[model samples]
Target: AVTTRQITVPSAPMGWASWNSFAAKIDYSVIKKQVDAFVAAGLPAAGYTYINIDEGWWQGTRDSAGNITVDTAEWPGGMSAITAYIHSKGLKAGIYTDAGKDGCGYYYPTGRPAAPGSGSEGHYDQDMLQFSTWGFDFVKVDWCGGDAEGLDAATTYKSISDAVGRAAATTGRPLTLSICNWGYQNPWNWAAGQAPLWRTSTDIIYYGNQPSMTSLLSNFDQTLHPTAQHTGYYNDPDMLMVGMDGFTAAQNRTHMNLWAISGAPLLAGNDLTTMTSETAGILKNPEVIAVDQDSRGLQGVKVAEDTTGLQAYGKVLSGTGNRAVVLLNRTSAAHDITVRWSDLGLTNASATVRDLWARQNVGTSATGYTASVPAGGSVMLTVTGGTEAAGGAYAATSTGRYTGVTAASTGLNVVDVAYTNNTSSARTATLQVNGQTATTVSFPPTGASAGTVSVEVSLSKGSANTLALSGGPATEGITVRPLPGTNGALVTGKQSGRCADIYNNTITNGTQAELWDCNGGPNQSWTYTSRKELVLYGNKCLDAYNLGTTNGTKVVIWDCNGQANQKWNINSDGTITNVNAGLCLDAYNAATANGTSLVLWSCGTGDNQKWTVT
Candidate 1:
C-alpha cells in the first residue's frame, strides 16, 4: 500500500483570508488589508504561512496571449505587487476562482460562461496559470453558483485538483493544492490521503453551530482503521467561522482548537484587521498550534462512535510516547460519556488526562474515564501512558519489552510505545494502550546486552517500571562458586587462586578454573549440585569428611568427596550462601568474568556477593 499522507500535519496552514464572514463579493482591498493586519498581528511566526485572497479578483477578460489577467477595476495595483508584498513578508499568496466562468468561475454567473454562462477553462488552465506566474501559492476553487451536486460537482472539483496538480508540477514552484469539494464525499477516507488536505464539510454560519468542526468530528469513527488509518494528508473540515454570526465567545475558541488538533487548515473568513483579542486569542493558542505543526503527519481520528450519542476521537502522534484523545457531545442535550480505555482498547484504564481546553490535568487511574459534556462542547485530552491499566497493557503480547532499537514510529495516543521488528522471530513488548497486540518496542542500548536480544516481563495491570542497575561480577573481595545463577559463569576479580571445592570437595586443575585471592589459596572457585558433590577450580580437590560433618572447618584439597552433602543446587533466586560452612559459597565480591573463583566465606551480611536479577 502507498504511504498515505494522513500521518500528521506540519504547522497548520496559517495566514489570513476572507471566507467565514464574507460570503461573496470579497474584493481585492479586503485581501490587501488582511495581509497588512496579518503582519501587524504577528501570526506569521506561529506558522500561518499564507495570505489568501478568496472569491474575488476576477474579471471577464484575457490578454493577447490568452493569459487571464486580474480585473484591474478591482485592483488597479495589479496582483503582482500584492504577491510580492506577501512574499516579502515570508508568506505565500493564494487567490480564488471557480471551475466555470461567465465569471461564474469567480464572479457570480449572473450572465457569463458555463451552462447558463460561458463555462470557461480560463480559471482551470489559463487563469490558474496566470495566478501561478504571479507567485500565487494557494487556490480556493468553489462551486458557489456552479453545479455543486451530482456528477457535475464531482467532475468540476476533480478537474480542478487534477488540473492544479499538473499546473503545480509544471510551474515547478510547488503550490499547495486545496480542493474545495465542500464536505460532500468522505474526505477523511477518500481525499485526506490523496490531497494535502480537503474540505470534509461545508462551513458554519455561526460560532455557536461550529458546522465545520462538529460535522467532521461527529463522524470521526473513520479514525478506526485497524492498520491502514488516514495518514499523510490532513482532513480539512472547512475554515474557521469562530467569530462569525455571533455565538458564545468561548465556543469560538473551542472551535479553533478542535481544528488545530484535527489538523484542519486555518482560513479566517472574518474581518482580520479589526479582529478582537478574544478572536485573536482563539487563533493564537500555542497548544493548538503544536497539534497542527506536529511532525508525525498523523491525523487524529474518531476511535469510537455511537448513534446513542457518545463521541471520541484519538490521534496517535509520531512520538515514542504520546497521543491525543478528544471527546465531543453531539446530542442536543447534555450527556454523560466515557472515553473508555476499553472503548478505544487503550489500557482500558484512567490516564493522566490533560484537558486541552480547560488547560489542566484531571488526574489518573484505571477502569475507564467519565465526564459530562454540554451539547456540542468537546473535551480534548493529551493522553499519556500510565501504570493503571484496565485491560492487559492493552499492548498486543502477554509479555515482552524490546531493549533493542528500531523505529515503528507509531502514531498512537497513550504514550505511544511503538517498536518495529524485521526479525525472523516475532518480537513484541507489552504496553498499556488499546490495540490487538502488545506494542513491539525497544529501549536505547545499555551495557552488557546485545542488540538482537529482546526481553519481556509482566506484573499487575498497573505497575511502575522502576529502573535501576546493580553491581554485577565486577567488585573486588570473594571467590565465586558456579551456581545456577549468572548463567553458570564464575565471577571473581582474579584469574586463579584458592578456590572453594565443588568436585570431590577439591580445588584443582583438569577442572573448570577461575581467579580469586588465596585466603589459603583453596577457597577460590567451585561448582556444585545442591545435594551432591562439590568441584573446585584448578588442580586441588578440597575434600570434606565423606563430604562434610562440619561447621566451617579447614578442609584439605584432596580427591573427590562423592558424598551428597558436598553438593549444591542453584536456585531461581541467585543466593549461593552455603549450609555446610555456615558461610556462603560466594564469588569474591561479585566480579564480572568467566574465570572468577568461588570462595567459602562466613555467611555475613556483606554485599560483596549477594546478587539480585533485574
Candidate 2:
C-alpha cells in the first residue's frame, strides 16, 4: 500500500488532449486557441480544467544541462510561458513523455523525419524536474518505447511515479501521472497506486474523421471495475471521441454514457474551437457528468443481456437511495427491455425516474420499469424513491422426484442454481451442458427456502446449447441461466412448507421476510443480484437487523445498497450465511408456524438454518 505516488486533487481529470485534435501537427497557435475556446464555450466553468499538450510537442533532443526541450519551432513561446498562460486562465497544464528512448508519435507536418519520438530514458529525474519547473500539472507516459525495452511495465511506472514524487517534493510542484500504454499488460490490475489514471483500451480510432465502431465496442467492453477506483486512481478508457465526426448522435451518447457510468476519465477528444452546439451539449450535460463525479466511487455494471444484444446496467449512487441505470440495446433495431428495481437494490413500490438526456421526469411504478431502446442506443436514468418489498413472490413447487431440468446459453456461461433441498440428508446434483456432465455439486439439507448452487458450462455461440440438471428428491425452483433476460423463482421454507412471503404484499423499508402459503407473487420470489444481493418486490433486498450478527437478529426487507449486511452466501451445505453478520439465517426458534420469520443465529447443523434461493 505504501508503494507509489497518488494525487488527491483533480480526482477524475477532465479537459482536452492535443493528439485527437491536431495530432502530429500540433503547434503553439492551436494550443492557445484551444485554451481560449475552452473558456469561451463555458467548458472551464463546467469543470473541464486540464489542458494537456499530448505527444508531438517534444523537440527530439535535450540541452547540455540534460533538460528536456520543447519543439521550439512549433512552441516558440516555450512550455513555461504556455503553462503560465493556462494557469492565468485558471486551468491546469499537462505534458507528455515516454519511459523509453522514444514515443509512439509521428513527426511529419513539421518536415522533420519521424524518429522514435523523444522520451525520458535515463533522464526521468531531470525531465520531471524540468516539467515541474515549467508549471506542468499533469504528465502522460506512453508505453511504446518502454514496451520495446526489457523492463517490466509495473517497474517502469513505479520508477516514474517515484521520480514525479521526488520532483514534487524537491520543486514543490505537484503533477498527475497518467499511464497510457494503450491497455497493454492489463494495466488496470497493476497501475492503481502507481498512477492516478491508466488507459484501459487502445486509442479511439477514427477512420478519416469518422468514429470507428470497432474501436468503440472494443473500448466499451473494457468498462468494468469501478470498485478499483477512488479519489486517487481510476481507469482511463482513453480519450472521449464524442463531438468528433463519424459517429451518430446515438453512438456519441452511448460513448459518453459508458465512460460516465464506468467512472473512467472524461477527457474530450474533439476540436473545442470547432465543436458543434449539439456536441457541446452532449459534453456539457451536468446530469451526465454528475454520474462520473459521484462521490460513492462505485462503478456501474451490465446486469442482464438479451438475445437481441440488449444489456441493462445499474449503479448504486452515493447518499440517498438512488441509482444510475442504462439500458443499452446492442441490436440493429428497436426493442423493449425491462429491469426490476430489485436488481438495482431498490425496494420502494414506486420510484421517480429521470431521463438524463431528455432532462425530464418519467412516471413511477410498484412492480418494475421498462424502456423501449433503439438499436445501438441506450436509456440513461436516475431512479429515486423505492420502498422495501412488503410481499412474497414466486410459486412454491410440491415434492417432485426427477428434480433435474435443462436450459440454453449464448456464450461461456456461469449458471447459478437457486434450489431448496427439503430432504433430511445431503443431496447431490449432476449438471450437464450440451450432453456433457460439466460438474456435480452437493445440496445440503435445509427447509424449503434453503440455498443455491453454481455450475460453469461452456455455452454455444448462436442457436441453443442444452443444459441438463439431475439430482435427488431436491426441489429446484429458480436458475440464473443468463437466459437473455431477467428472471426469478420462488423460495419455500422446509419447516413451514410455505413460500417465503413479504409482509402483507406491501413494499416498505423493514418489512418482515416471513413464511407464508405458497403463491406466485412478486413478494415471495427473489433474485440473486450480480452483486449477490437477495432481492424481493421490485426494489428491496433481504437485510439483517442493524447489520447485526447476534443470534435471533431479525432478517428484514430493505432497499438494496450493495451492503454486506444484506448479502448472503448459500453454500453447498444448504445453510444461508449472512455475508456481514457471518451467521446462519435460521427460522426463528425453529418454529413450524405459518408466519415464522427468518433470523440470524449460530449454525447448529439443523434444518432450520438451511435454505434455498432459485
Candidate 3:
C-alpha cells in the first residue's frame, strides 16, 4: 500500500515570526513584548500561536563539549527562559539557524554584529536536541551556510531532518522541521517526506526594506507546486508580510488570500505591538484562516486567467464540491473577473458564494461567479452547495462497456471518463458511440485508485446511447452532458454585417478568423463551452495567434487545448473579449470589406468591435 508521510501537523502551521519586521535586531525583551501584543491583538484566538525568534539571538559560540551556547547579555535568562515565557502565554516557540557554519546574520547583519559558527552543520543532532530541550516546537533550518560551502541541498537537508527525528525521539518532544533552501534543486520533490514544510521561494520582503507588491506576487507565483503539497506537508513562501510597511490594506488582504489558497504556512512577519486595527482585522480573518487550516491540505492551482492581469486560483476544500477561490487583479486598473465552476473542477453550473474577507454571503451564482476586483487587490471566496456530475451505469463483467448514457442535444456533447491507471505510461483507446467512432480517449496515469478525464463527442439527443472503449484502461463509468450555451451561433460583426469566418472555410490550425458574408455555413458556427472556450466544429477553438497579449494580434482557429487564449467572455455590451489577452474581437481598422481580417484590439465602444452571437 502506498503510504504518505506520517506528520504531526495535518494542516498548515499558523504563527508569528520576527524576521521581516525586526530581522537580526531581536532579543529576549523584543520577543516578550511581541508575544504579549500578539495575545493582546487576539492573534492567538485567530489561530496564530507560534512565537518565533528568528536569527540574531545567539553569538554562535560553542563550549569544549561542542555544545552551542547563547549569549547571556542579550537573552538575560538564556534561551530556555524565553521559551518558557512564550509557553507561559500558551504559545509554541520557534528558532532559526543556518545549514552552514556562517549564518545569514554573519553575512548581512541588520543592526547587529557579524557572528560566525552559527550553523548546525556538524552538530545537527546536538543542536536539534538542544533546541528541543529548550522547548522549541518549530525549527527553521536556513541554507546560507550550506550554499556558501557548496553542499548538496537535498542531501544536506535530509541529514538535518534525520537529526531532527532523532532529537525528537530522544527529547520526547515533537519538532516540526521547516526546510529553507530558497527553492534550490526543487525541494518540493523530496522535502514533504522529510519535513513538515519547505520554503519554495526567496523571502517575500528583504530585511530592512518595505514590502513591494511585485515582490509579493513574484514569491506567490514561484510557490505553485500543487502536486508536491498534500496530506499535512506544505510549501512555505517565506513569511507573511501582511502588516508590513509599504503595503496597503487591500494588498494585505490579497496576500492573506493568496497564502490561504496556496495552503502555505501563515507565519505573520510584522510588529504585532503597533499594528493597526485594520491590519489586525486582515490577519484575524477567521473564514480566510479556515481555508488555510483545511484538513485536506491540498494546494490551490491557477484555475483560470480570464484577463491579461486577472487570475483565479482554486483550492478544493474538505467537503463535497466545496472550493476556496481567489480572484486576483494585477493590472493597473480595476476590472471584472470571473471564475467558472467548470474551471474549478465543479460539475454543477450554480453554487453558493461566500466572501471570506467581508464575512458575508454573496448569494448564489449560475455557471460561475464574477467580482469587480481593484488593481493590486483580490477577492477571496468560498463556493459551496454544488453538485457533481451524474454518472452512467457500466457492465459488471466488461471492462470498458458503458450504457444508459443520455445527452440533451443531438449534435455534440461532452462525456467524462472516470478510470484508474496504475502504470506510469498513459493509455489510449477508441471511443465508440452507437457503433460509430466519436473520438480518441487518452487516460493518463492516475497513480491512485481513481481519476477522471473529459472528451467532447457526438451523441444522440436521447437515452439508450451505448458507449464502449476498445483498448484503453477500464473505466468506472461515464457522464454525458450537453454543451453550455447555444450551438451553431454566428459571431456577426455589428458594423460590417459579416460573420467571423474561417478563411476560405479552412479546417486546419492557424486558419485566420476573418470577416465574410453570413451564409449560415458550418465554418461560421460556434459554440461556447462550459470552460469559456469558443468551439468550432466541436474540435477547434477560437484562439489568439501565438498566445499574444498585445493589441492588433491576429485571431486564429486552433485545436482545442483548453488554454486561456481560447476562452472568450461574451460581455453585456455586445462585445466578445478574449480571456487571455483581455482584448476584443475586431474587424481590423473598422473595415466593412468582405475579406477584412479579424484581430484583437483594445476593448472599446466601437461598432466594429461589437458583435451579436446568434
Candidate 4:
C-alpha cells in the first residue's frame, strides 16, 4: 500500500543560498564546498536548513538529442549521489526548474516542460522520477515574463503546478512546490488557488543595486494581498540579494524585516555559507523570524509614505490578535516616523507595543508610538492587545497627509478648491493642515453646505494641510480631514477628485478624485462627510455636478454632501470599487490629476485596483 504524504515545507524556508554575488557561475565543486560551509556556519541547528541550487546546473548542450541529462562534470555521479551527499549532511537538498521553455530568466533555452499529466510527454514524468529518486525536497517553477506576452498566467502557472502535484502523487515522495510566476500572473487571484507557495513580485535586488526593489516597493499592495487563498500558500519575492554586489548589512536587515512581516519566502539568494557575521545576524533574527513563521500566514502592507523618507507597513495575522508594524527609512539620513497608535486602528484604547528586533515592549501607548530608524534601516514592532480589529476598520486607521495646500500648489500637482455658494453669497476662508494654514481661500455659502463645489484656486502640499470651509456665519471657517478611521463610516466624495502625484489641473465639474497613482505625500487621501464638507488630502473633496456618482461620471473636488453617491466603503475583499456604479473603482493608473476631476468606470483588472489593508 502507498502512503498518503503531503508535500510541504515549514512556515518559511531557512537555507544556504547561491545567487546575488554568485550571480558568479557555480560549479559542482563550488556547490559541494558550500554544503560543508552550511555546516560550518552552524546554520542548520538554528533551523537555517536547505542548501538549494538556484540555476546554472546544466551544460550548454544536451547529450544526444531529445533525452535530458545533467553534465557529469557539474553533477558528477548524477543527481542521486548529490542528493545522497546532502542526505548524509542531515539537511534537505532543493532543486530548480522552469515551467516555460525558457527558464525563469529565459537564460536556459531548449527547456520544455508539459502539463503534469499531458500524457503525451512522459518525458516530464521521467524528470520527476529522476528528481524524486534524487531526494529533491523542494522545487521552484517560474513563468518569468511569458505571461506578459499573451501567455495566460493562471494557465501557465497551473500547468507547472499540476506537473508537480502529479509527480508527488505518483512517486509517493513529498515535495514543497513553489510556483514562481512573477508579476505577470498574479498568484493572488489565479495561481494562488493552485500553488502551495507563490511568487508575488518580479525579481528584487538588494539595496538600490537592482532598481527593481524600488519598483517592487512601490507595488507593495500587490506583493502583500490579505486574502483567504494566500493564507495557506506563501508569497515569495524571488531570492534575497543581501551581501551581493554592493549592499550593506543595514539594507539587508531592513529588507529582511519587510519580507518577514509580509510572510514572504526567506530563501537566501547570496552565498549564505560565506556571508559575513552581520548578514548571518540579520538573517537569523529570531523575533523577525517569528513574524514569518506566524501560523496566521499573514503579510504586512504599506500605510504611509512621504518625500522625507518616512514609510509605514502594518500587518494583521490569524489568532494572537497582534499587528506587526514596520517603519522603513528610505532616505540617505535617518528620520523619526510616528506610529501614532491613533493612525494604526487603535482609536479605542492604547496598545502594548514591543520591539521585535530589540526584544522589548515599548509599553502602553494611546496615540501610538514613535520610532526613529537609521538611514537604509528599519524598525519592526509587534503590537498586541487592543482587541482584534474588525475588517471594516482597516482603512480608517491610515489618514496620512495632503500634498496640496498653497498658492503655488494650484492646479494639478496641487489641490483644486471647490466650495458652496456659487453665483451668489460667496464668502472666503483659508485651508489648514497640521495647524498650518494656506495663503489662499475657499468660499462656501451660509446655507449651501453639501454638493460638488468646483474651486478656481489650487493648493500645494505641506504640513497640517487640510481643506477649510469659510464663509457666512453658519458655514464659516471649518477645517476638516477625511475620517475613514472614525465612527465606522467612509467619507464620501463631493465631486470626483484626484490625489495629485504630478498634476492634472483641468477645472471642470463632475470629475473623479480616484485613489489613482500619486506621490501620496499629503494630497492623496481625502475625506467626504455628509454635513456639507469634503476634506482634501489636507482636507479637500471633489465637488462636481453637485455630488454625482454615475457611470462615465467625471469626478471633481468640492465640498462634502451627505449624499449616497459620496459614500465609499473599502471592503474586506481588498478591492475599492465604487458603491454607485456597483463596480470596482480605482485610480487612473494610480495617477494624480490635480485641479482635474476623476472619472468612474468598471474596475479593470490591474495592479492599481489592489488596495492594501493595514
Q: Which residue window of length 10 is worst by lDDT in model 4?
A: 391-400
C-alpha lDDT of residue 85 in model 3: 95
Candidate ranking (lDDT, best to worst)? 3, 2, 4, 1
TM-scores vs. true structure, each candidate: 0.55, 0.62, 0.66, 0.60
Q: Which residue pairs collide, candidate 3?
A: 100-145
lDDT by residue for model 4 over 240-334, one digit each (tens)? Answer: 66555456766677777887777777776666556788777777788887787665444454445433357677665433336788988767897
Instruction: For residue 244, give model 4's deviation from the true position in Å.
Output: 2.7
Instruction: Report RMSD for candidate 4.
Output: 19.1
* Error at 202, model 1, angstroms: 3.5
lDDT of 1 by residue, 49-155 (tens): 77887644555456687666665676767888788878888999987765555434333432223323223344577666667878888876655545532335545
Residues 318-419, candidate 2, lDDT per residue (tens digit)?
A: 543477888888678999987777656556367888889999998787656788999778888888775532221122233322123332322222333456
Regions of model 2 farther than 4 Å from truth: 1-10, 106-112, 206-209, 387-614
The segments of candidate 1 whose C-alpha lies over 4 angstroms from its true place after superposition are 1-12, 101-123, 144-162, 169-171, 184-194, 206-229, 304-307, 331-336, 348-350, 386-614
Ranking by TM-score: 3, 2, 4, 1
* Winning candidate number (lDDT): 3
What would the TM-score be for candidate 3 when compared with the true structure?
0.66
